[PDB]
Ligand binder design. Structure first.
Ligand SMILES: Cc1cc2nc3c(=O)[nH]c(=O)nc-3n(C[C@H](O)[C@H](O)[C@H](O)COP(=O)(O)OP(=O)(O)OC[C@H]3O[C@@H](n4cnc5c(N)ncnc54)[C@H](O)[C@@H]3O)c2cc1C
Ligand SMILES: Cc1cc2nc3c(=O)[nH]c(=O)nc-3n(C[C@H](O)[C@H](O)[C@H](O)COP(=O)(O)OP(=O)(O)OC[C@H]3O[C@@H](n4cnc5c(N)ncnc54)[C@H](O)[C@@H]3O)c2cc1C
Ligand SMILES: NC(=O)C1=CN([C@@H]2O[C@H](COP(=O)(O)OP(=O)(O)OC[C@H]3O[C@@H](n4cnc5c(N)ncnc54)[C@H](OP(=O)(O)O)[C@@H]3O)[C@@H](O)[C@H]2O)C=CC1
Ligand SMILES: NC(=O)C1=CN([C@@H]2O[C@H](COP(=O)(O)OP(=O)(O)OC[C@H]3O[C@@H](n4cnc5c(N)ncnc54)[C@H](OP(=O)(O)O)[C@@H]3O)[C@@H](O)[C@H]2O)C=CC1
Lengths: 489, 489
């Protein structure tokens, strides 16, 4: 067995940050375990994590590809002429370019390990033998051959999450986001199941790359997609996906899937409705990846919903064992996992406690058009504060009247504590929204007030200047009650 | 003769804000004077101002159209196929769409005047008869017939600026940005004269719409374009314009222009080099429009360079006469002019003095790719502060390695006071830059430190998140001198 200050199980976003920082900033001896060195089947995730291999990085490339469908059409309003009937979207090329880009990242990460002293990679499946020993095996099977036994002063659990699949008849005919990344050809008809960001993101990707006579359908078991997001924006994204040819089935959920004779899938819904598609993609949730770690050997406690139970400092109930990222089933974001890994390492090896702030985190949805958001939505804020103000701007930007995409209304909302003007949340929908919101996150850290926004001089002409052009609330909540104007008193 | 609380000469960015505020917020009687009711020849600007008619608004629509040249090309990396030889950029269509959009704004300003009590528009040329009378005439000639005599308690000068044309033989064969907006056809060969934002922005526009066998040349009298901007950005923009097929002639300046027998232009540079082009667009500066105001009648004082001299509250040497916007030859931006207009009105009619902060104003250049900037460049900071740190990131984002535009390095630079970490300037080059910098403007009003950026959680994947990923200075200025590391002293 080999001895290490820190052993990390999972070479993903959080795991690599922790490992890199411990080794290069604190001079510790670090071991990092992952199940394969490059993306794709059989394990999908790999060295670099979910985000690099089957997540943020590849899907952003694919969304960027999808945006060209809109660009090509929209150029005509600006005088661009070309043979429309010659236009074809080559999925095979997209996927091949994506694969090369992901592989290049895989390769650079193994170059990092090769070049970095005291930071070593171990290929295999990690699990807990005792509270000081990580065993590395050939496969996920607990009975597979032992490759390595790693003695660890500290153990970090960073194995992320995995797609949830519903227990319905014909689930074997369905796929998840994992497989979506490797489809040999683009589906003519596809059902995306779920109303969260993965389902909305992929619907837009499939919508652009669909062969002729194609149809993308997204279904969601409740009334309105994208729960947790601003309600205006939820309603507007629904309208804007619809206007780009995507069918949105709300209050619907698959009961059953079967094969048609030609090989296509026949979906039956709980309500009795039916749909024939070429691909059914489940995006109904991601669950912490705890099953292979043999946590019962050491008694690391889990949450009711299956995450590793931690405190604010990422500590489990076992003293030298920690958990960060998706395995904790909190905020499933890459930069949050990274921030968590860095704080952990500062605490443990730097001996100066640091915890990640999980509030006021800026995030994005790469829908078409995209969402950018930071902080509280108005419903949540109205429950915590007696007086809240909402500043709303919503209209089609000029260039989209010219482009023909008149449906692309840009939404900008600011939610404040109206007692002192403190900005509680900012919510954006439209082109550039993810890029705009980043520095907004810095503003909220500094406890910006609405006056800090409107007293800042705009950049003209942009969409972002709308954030600096709102002085009078559109409406209020007074102890939970929505109203246009404050009572005369 | 008509009596008014406020008479505004010039119905542009600053004038309209001031007029609207005085009428609607303070209930004053206001007159606003402009020379045209809609955009275009002979006087180009009109109701709405330079920005609405021959500036920011149409310019941005035209750059947006220009971006499609890149989009169509870059789509191929993501699998998009089409008949490339069928591609045509219809300049006439762009201009027609631009015109309708501008005209729509012209028309809406007329409804504003009609619906608003005590806010009236007068068509004609405004000038000062005396301290308390603005005279409106048919033309700029002070001998032309009087249309109106407006008795004014207060007078606001807001006539903006006008293109500078060098005194060279054959200047009559050259145009400015004004005429560029109305060219009947797109020029095959064009020379844009100047290294500032207008010359660069139009170079990009003409480059996208040029007919077959076209060439855009930009010339600049000194060594490196875009003086006043970040040095890394100046160098990068030069590289990236060149890579998109624009010729940049540095250390060259037109000495004369003559008309060829085919109507094209023969340019001779001070060096003796020559170049044949179809259009010569002068973009060597903009100078305050003071001549037609007959300021000598009242003795309003001008600065050495020709602007109306004002204090920080926009007051002239004459108590009831004020000046804002480009006529003051300070910061020539629409939102600054607007902010000055609002502050002046609060001061004069609210009797609570307010002034515009001309520091840390965010701004953009809509080059391809675009620049976004706020605050000080490092050479300027190194003079005001004893120790400054520069945080720098410059690389081609993944998508542009796939797109084929490998020359598109995104540049992010933060300049700080290294004594306390206070952010002094932020400078960006690349897609989204103008949108990213807006909320950065808010951050600098809040006196953000570098640590406020790097302790903010990133939105991934974005270009903007680079701003939150820089912890270690790339280099420093100590007592005005550049060095990679701080001295041990
Ligand atoms: C389709 C999709 C799109 C997404 N888009 C975004 C986005 O746009 N922005 C964003 O911020 N986030 C996005 N995410 C979420 C983001 O990918 C995760 O939040 C982040 O990757 C979690 O990081 P982590 O360190 O917790 O784990 P991961 O990055 O998932 O890394 C866990 C690693 O552990 C390995 N592993 C698992 N079991 C073992 C074992 N027992 N032994 C050894 N190794 C093991 C896995 O192979 C994996 O590489 C997306 C996710 C998906 C699925
Ligand atoms: C090509 C170009 C691109 C630009 N791009 C941007 C940009 O992207 N972002 C930005 O912030 N700024 C931009 N600007 C600058 C911006 O347009 C100006 O800073 C702004 O319009 C100035 O506002 P103003 O109120 O001072 O004057 P203006 O908006 O120019 O208004 C002055 C008005 O007064 C009228 N007038 C003149 N003389 C008389 C007279 N004697 N009697 C009656 N009326 C008169 C004129 O017709 C004009 O309408 C651009 C300018 C140009 C030329
Ligand atoms: O971001 P999320 O991970 O919550 O995305 C999952 C999406 O699928 C929905 N969903 C969650 N569980 C199920 C289920 N078991 N069956 C069908 N749909 C589900 C969620 O709806 P919801 O948020 O309404 O639970 C959400 O819209
Ligand atoms: O103007 P400014 O405010 O500096 O920047 P602007 O944004 O107005 O751009 C004007 C450009 O033209 C150049 N220029 C100014 N005067 C002349 C001249 N008379 N002949 C040729 N080129 C000229 C400037 O060079 P420069 O950077 O040297 O001022 C600058 O690059």
């Amino acid at each position: 067995s080999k001895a290490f200050d820190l052993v990390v199980i999972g070479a993903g976003s959080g795991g690599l940050e922790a490992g890199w920082n411990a080794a290069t900033l604190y001079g510790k001896r670090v071991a990092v375990v992952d199940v394969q060195t490059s993306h794709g089947p059989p394990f999908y995730a790999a060295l670099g994590g979910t985000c690099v291999n089957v997540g943020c990085v590849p899907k952003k490339l694919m969304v960027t590809g999808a945006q060209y469908m809109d660009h090509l059409r929209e150029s005509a309003g600006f005088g661009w002429e070309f043979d429309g009937s010659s236009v074809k979207a080559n999925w095979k090329k997209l996927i091949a370019a994506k694969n090369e880009a992901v592989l290049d990242i895989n390769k650079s990460y193994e170059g990092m390990f090769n070049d970095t002293e005291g930071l070593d990679f171990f290929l295999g499946w990690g699990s807990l033998e005792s509270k000081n020993v990580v065993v590395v095996r050939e496969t996920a099977d607990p009975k597979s051959a032992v490759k390595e036994r790693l003695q660890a002063d500290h153990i970090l659990l960073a194995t992320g999450s995995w797609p949830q699949m519903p227990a319905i008849p014909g689930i074997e005919h369905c796929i998840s986001s994992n497989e979506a990344f490797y489809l040999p050809e683009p589906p003519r008809r596809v059902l995306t199941v779920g109303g969260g960001f993965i389902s909305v993101e992929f619907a837009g990707i499939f919508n652009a790359y669909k062969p002729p006579g194609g149809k993308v359908t997204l279904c969601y078991r409740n009334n309105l997609i994208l729960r947790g997001f601003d309600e205006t924006i939820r309603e507007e994204v629904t309208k804007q996906l619809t206007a780009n040819g995507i069918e949105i089935m709300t209050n619907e959920n698959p009961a059953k899937v079967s094969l048609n004779t030609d090989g296509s899938k026949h979906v039956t819904f709980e309500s009795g409705k039916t749909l024939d598609v070429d691909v059914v993609m489940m995006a109904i949730g991601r669950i912490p990846r705890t099953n292979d770690l043999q946590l019962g050997n050491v008694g690391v406690k889990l949450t009711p919903k299956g995450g590793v139970q931690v405190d604010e400092f990422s500590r489990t109930n076992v003293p030298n064992i920690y958990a960060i990222g998706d395995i904790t089933d909190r905020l499933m974001l890459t930069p949050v996992a990274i921030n968590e890994g860095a704080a952990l390492v500062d605490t443990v090896f730097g001996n100066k406690p640091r915890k990640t702030d999980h509030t006021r985190v800026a995030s994005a949805v790469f829908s078409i058009p995209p969402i950018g958001t930071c902080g509280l939505i108005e419903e949540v804020a109205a429950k915590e504060f007696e007086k809240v103000a909402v500043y709303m701007s919503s209209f089609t930007p000029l260039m989209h009247n010219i482009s023909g995409s008149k449906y692309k209304k840009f939404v900008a909302k600011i939610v404040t504590n109206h007692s002192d003007g403190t900005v509680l949340g900012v919510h954006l929908l439209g082109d550039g929204a993810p890029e705009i919101i980043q520095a907004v996150g810095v503003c909220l850290r500094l406890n910006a007030k609405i006056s800090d926004f409107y007293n800042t001089i705009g950049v003209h002409p942009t969409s972002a200047e709308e954030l600096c052009s709102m002085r009078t609330p559109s409406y209020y909540y007074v102890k939970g009650e929505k109203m246009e104007k404050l009572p005369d008193s």
